[PDB]
Amino acid sequence: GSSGSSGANCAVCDSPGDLLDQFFCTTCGQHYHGMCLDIAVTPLKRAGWQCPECKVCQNCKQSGEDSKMLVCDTCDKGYHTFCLQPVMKSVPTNGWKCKNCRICISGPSSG
Ligand SMILES: [Zn+2]
Ligand SMILES: [Zn+2]
Ligand SMILES: [Zn+2]
Ligand SMILES: [Zn+2]
């Protein structure tokens, strides 16, 4: 008479809380509440979400310069300032976007 299905709890607060509410990494397989990581739950982030512990630079693919790593607010992808085109000599205050996101609505929009 025991479920015993407790695991992969929040690596920030260490609590099961809500599973759906919090995202689930694919690499490590951890969970993190939107508040614990101060992330904005979006219909895009959910799909293909990656924790800040596994997420790497899709440009150079080298985990280390986390500090100099910009994190979009939509796609939630990590990109090193120097690994940006153009490059981000410096880091913005708040509200950053990537090229893959800024992509405007252009093309034959189908159903
Ligand atoms: Zn948490
Ligand atoms: Zn992870
Ligand atoms: Zn890089
Ligand atoms: Zn983006």
Q: What is the CATH number of the domain that holds 5?
A: 3.30.40.10
Pair of tokens at residue 12:
């920030």
Q: Obtained via which technique?
A: NMR
39 CA distance to ligand 3 middle (Å): 22
User: 53, 51, 60, 55: which is closest to 81 by C-alpha?
Assistant: 60
Q: How far, in Å, CA of 80 to CA of 59, rounded?
A: 8
CB under 8 A, 24+ apart: contacts of 3-8 = none
How many folded domains does the chain comprise? Answer: 1
Exposure pattern of 63-93 as b/e (b: 16+ CB <10 Å)?
A: eeeeeebbebeebbbbbbbebeeeebeeeee
Cα 66 from chain centroid (whole Å): 13
Half-sphere exposure of 104 (CA within 13 A, CB side): 1
Which stretch of DSSP H or E encloses residue 99?
Answer: helix 99-102
Task: For residue 56, give its domain range.
Answer: 1-111
Give 84's contacts (C-beta < 8 A, 6+ positions apart): 59, 70
Residue 68 backbone dihedrals phi, psi, to 5 degrees:
-85, 40
Contact 33, 11 (CB under 8 A): no
3 CA distance to ligand 4 middle (Å): 39
107 CA distance to ligand 2 middle (Å): 34
